[PDB]
Amino acid sequence: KPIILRFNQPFIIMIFDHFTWSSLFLARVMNPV
Amino acid sequence: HHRGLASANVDFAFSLYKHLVALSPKKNIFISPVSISMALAMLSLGTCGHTRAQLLQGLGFNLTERSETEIHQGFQHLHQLFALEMTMGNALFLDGSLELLESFSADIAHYYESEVLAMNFQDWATASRQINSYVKNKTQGKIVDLFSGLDSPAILVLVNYIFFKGTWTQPFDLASTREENFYVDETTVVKVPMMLQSSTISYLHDSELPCQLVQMNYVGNGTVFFILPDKGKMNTVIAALSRDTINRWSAGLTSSQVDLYIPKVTISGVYDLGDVLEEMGIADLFTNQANFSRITQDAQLKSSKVVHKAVLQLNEEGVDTAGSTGVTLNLT
Ligand SMILES: CC(=O)[C@H]1CC[C@H]2[C@@H]3CCC4=CC(=O)CC[C@]4(C)[C@H]3CC[C@]12C
């Protein structure tokens, strides 16, 4: 039975370069629109 | 050279983010840490004394274990590696009344491959519009109006830009996208385009922290963590953000069948990072005591502003993001 995961509340995005491990982008999404 | 300053830059990244978050209760935050790090590292090339040491330490570097040279070579190797699509670049906009020291020009060319563009800052309205035009092109239209005309004057402006286009290895289903409730808080609910995919995804319900997370790749080297803290637990999770936590998450993540609902996101941050950088220890740079004596021979400079703009467009195909950091300097 599949896990249901809804990003319908404040969440965090972290974007990394796997090669250098750089933190490219960091987000706190309180309101996506 | 790959990972030499990962630990420092990521520490700086998390730190800056945590400070930014504490100084704004309810707003979206979006930043490019690597752009801020590269901008400030370049700026340190013109610094001396307490100003220099304080800035490099605030950027996460231990100066007793790695030289200034090693740090700049690391940023050079980073820059080479970046410059489906990723681009990163540095520019220096200079007043005609300012003769740069040769060794400074040599260093920014060597380590940061900076463009050097001679402008007339007497008309800030035109100068700022020109610099803005430059950043807009370099970020393929994503970052506009980086500088205001409201801003103070300047004699010298340093700019970093970053642009990134990632394609999900696992795209969302365009036919499944629909309006759903987004609970901003207990009382505030908005309508948002919510994407779906049902597939094998790296998932972890954290046992040590009140959150679940997934990890997703882009074609090529990019990867992304989406972290959903439990109702009202955002700040708890944020406080735990660290390289160590990412390592523990990375060990815990398991391929699982997940119905994954993630909204389309379009957000953009605009920051004056002065206050925050001072909270992080980087202070003398903004005062009359600033030591910029590696830039020119006989002018006393200080930083007036560090600005940062970042934009995120997230959809079913992937991510379109850009960032840019500006530092203005003027005569004290
Ligand atoms: C294996 C993997 O997915 C990579 C992608 C991003 C990587 C992390 C990026 C940030 C990072 C910086 C460090 O200096 C220590 C290791 C870590 C914490 C990395 C561990 C391995 C990760 C999680």
Author numbering:
A (entry chain B): 351 to 383
B (entry chain A): 13 to 95, 101 to 349
What is the paper's account of this structure, in its own sentences?
Corticosteroid-binding globulin (CBG) is a glycosylated plasma protein implicated in steroid transport and delivery. By its primary structure, CBG is classified as a clade A member of the serine protease inhibitor (SERPIN) family, together with the closely related alpha-1-antichymotrypsin, alpha-1-antitrypsin (AAT) and thyroxine-binding globulin (TBG). Contrary to the proteinase inhibitors alpha-1-antichymotrypsin and AAT, CBG and TBG have no known inhibitory function. While CBG does not act as a protease inhibitor, it is a substrate for neutrophil elastase and becomes cleaved in the reactive center loop (RCL).
It represents the first crystal structure of CBG in complex with progesterone and, more importantly, the sequence of the RCL corresponds to that of wild-type CBG and is not replaced by the sequence of AAT Pittsburgh as in a previous study with a CBG-AAT chimera. Second, the RCL was cleaved during crystallization, and upon structure solution it became obvious that CBG is depicted in the SERPIN R-conformation with a fully antiparallel six-stranded β-sheet A, in which the RCL is integrated as β-strand s4 into sheet A. The RCL is cleaved after Thr349 or Ser350. If cleavage occurred after Thr349, the cleavage site would be homologous to that of human AAT after cleavage with neutrophil elastase. As a result of this novel cleavage site, the inserted RCL segment is four residues longer than expected, and a more extended β-strand s4 is formed with additional main-chain hydrogen bonds with neighboring strands s3 and s5. From a structural point of view, this novel cleavage site makes sense because it allows for the formation of an extended β-strand s4A with main-chain hydrogen-bonds connecting the former RCL segment to strands s5A and s3A over the entire length of β-sheet A. The stacking of the indol ring of Trp371 against the cyclohexane ring of progesterone constitutes a hallmark for ligand binding to CBG. Trp371 itself packs via a cation-π-interaction with Arg15. Only a single direct hydrogen bond is formed between progesterone and CBG, namely between the carbonyl oxygen at C-20 and the side chain of Gln232. Our structural data suggest that this difference can be attributed to the fact that progesterone does not form some of the hydrogen bonds observed in the cortisol complex because it lacks the hydroxyl groups attached to atoms C-11 and C-17.
